Amino acid sequence: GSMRGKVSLEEAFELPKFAAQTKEKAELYIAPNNRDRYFEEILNPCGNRLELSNKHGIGYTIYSIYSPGPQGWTERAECEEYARECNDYISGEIANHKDRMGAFAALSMHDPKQASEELTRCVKELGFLGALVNDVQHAGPEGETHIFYDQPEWDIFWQTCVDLDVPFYLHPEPPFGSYLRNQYEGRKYLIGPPVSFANGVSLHVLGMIVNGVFDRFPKLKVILGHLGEHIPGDFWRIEHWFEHCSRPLAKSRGDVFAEKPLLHYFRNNIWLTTSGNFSTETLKFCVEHVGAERILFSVDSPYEHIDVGCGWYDDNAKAIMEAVGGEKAYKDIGRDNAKKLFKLGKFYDSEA
Amino acid sequence: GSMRGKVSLEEAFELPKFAAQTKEKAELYIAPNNRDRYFEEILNPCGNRLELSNKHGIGYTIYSIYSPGPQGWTERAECEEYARECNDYISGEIANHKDRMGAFAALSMHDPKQASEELTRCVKELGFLGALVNDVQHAGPEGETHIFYDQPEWDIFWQTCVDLDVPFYLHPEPPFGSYLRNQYEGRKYLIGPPVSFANGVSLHVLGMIVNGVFDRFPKLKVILGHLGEHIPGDFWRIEHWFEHCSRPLAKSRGDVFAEKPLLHYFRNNIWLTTSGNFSTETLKFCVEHVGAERILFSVDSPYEHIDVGCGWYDDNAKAIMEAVGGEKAYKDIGRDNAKKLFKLGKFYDSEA
Ligand SMILES: [Zn+2]
Ligand SMILES: [Zn+2]
């Protein structure tokens, strides 16, 4: 049947002093009847969301800054101070619940050296378990500069991730600037989970692949939410296009291109979570391609409801077991894959 | 178990007088060893691609303008003249092979009424079978203006599609303007099939859904290539988000929103093709969600090779039949779904 001790690791917060900014996210992502709960959860890591996690059989929650978080702060010095404030805040909150809470670093991604230094501080001094970054870092006096991490200057940062041996969770963020105006103004309800989020993350991680990040750093670990941000349904089409067009075309120009097949990266460097994607059928398709050991349960609180995400995994245990290859695979996805990936010791309900 | 008489309907051409424009497409989409074949095929609807189609068991090819085609022509008067020339040209070419060739209208989509009139001319006077439009119509310097068809003025055009009772094929196109520079300059090999194409089409058709196009025009027929442009893998997540967030939020503001579940539109208004997606596993997943009667074989020539797409469907007939639910489903996908959708009479090998 169902299990306790599940690990959930796409679980967002904001600094309480910025409560007013969370009402702006609520207007993008939260139905009216869910506003009271959203505001309580996003501002209280140890509040009712912890009680729900305990009731619903979560053993370890890894908290991260919400979106865009620092990636929406276009002034470098202000962005760097905010990221540090987020890390110091969540470190203080999780200190009282070490058996069931951890955190991922919030980072200013304006400068690779500075981001590497803050990640190192979070991991070595605060015991954080990785980084979670909300897609491209926006920058410039009017915010139009889009900083992607698949360019060579970011190699110092990837080297830091590998040296610390912690994963990088690439989370989505809403559209900004001319992209928001040109492509979303007339379909604003498509901002967020319906399409815009995965459109951005898939572009960015495929960018890391085709620009050779994982070839230069074969030990690098990256996590994608939402069962891989559109990519698994296109595993065949993307790899086929790389074989039929992209690889020989790039080679003919002397341009950098990924050295391995698409699935190699998804079987060695990338892990997927079930955040906001409580779909047994989609989970099955993903398992069939990447392996049950490469998918991690997660909720996506507070944008999703802990009781709903845990309810799916718990209440459909038998059907999910059939879909993912048996009892061990089900416990691996629920808990044991993440326990091993994050090198967690004993934690709440971890052997239950 | 293979069949002849297959229908293939994402098969592109360019006007011979614009041969020079095809070189820019080759630099985006065609490996060096495939250039000679691409140039021959894109400029000769009755050339070797017809010989290959006859050899490989295609009974009916529906030709369409390549991409962006008119959607990249930013000046309305020139765009309208080009679309007319494309339609008159392809009408003349297919006249010599009526038993095995048809066409979809090329349209200037600067003005809903003007596009409606050209579609009517193509259907009523030239016998065309629908329209194929390459995503948003570009206008303005560098194409920075993006004209989407999910805004209320486009109801004039949707009413025309319903009056004529023909489908609208929403095909992808490359990025333009600031989006091209900001989001693709550092990952240029992701322009096209790897991600950019489906990112645009999925945004656009989901836009039509959430702005209520299919609620006001429940008889409207739309076709998507590439097994649905990322949407099927996200069927659960999109509909869940619409239920949990978007529909109650829009209702609370009095904003228009899709009245029915996402899968209703994919089971009533939208058909998928296999263009560029010769994946038995992805096809199976789509069949399980939308029904085998809603998926149409297609190749995507000349960007894909007719021998490769037909080779997949023909050589793996037994495995595909098992994946899609049996012989009738296999013949439906190969031929009979399209025969019925486009009301084709007898055609070459149509009872084979
Ligand atoms: Zn999230
Ligand atoms: Zn095509």
From Swiss-Prot, chains A, B:
Its EC number is 4.1.1.91. One of its GO terms (cellular component) is cytosol. Pfam families: Amidohydro_2. It comes from the Eukaryota. GO terms for biological process: secondary metabolic process. Optimum temperature is 40 degrees Celsius for the decarboxylase activity and 30 degrees Celsius for carboxylase activity. Signal peptide: none annotated. Optimum pH is 5.5 for decarboxylase activity. It catalyses: salicylate + H(+) = phenol + CO2. Inhibited by AgNO(3), HgCl(2), p-chloromercuribenzoic acid and NiCl(2). The keyword Lyase applies. Keywords: Decarboxylase, Lyase. Reversibly catalyzes the regioselective carboxylation of phenol to form salicylic acid. Involved in a pathway for the degradation of salicylate via phenol. Also catalyzes the decarboxylation of beta-resorcylic acid (2,4-dihydroxybenzoic acid) into resorcinol (1,3-dihydroxybenzene), gamma-resorcylic acid (2,6-dihydroxybenzoic acid) into resorcinol, 2,3-dihydroxybenzoic acid into catechol (1,2-dihydroxybenzene), and 4-aminosalicylic acid into 3-aminophenol. Belongs to the metallo-dependent hydrolases superfamily. This is Salicylate decarboxylase. It comes from Cutaneotrichosporon moniliiforme. The gene is sdc.
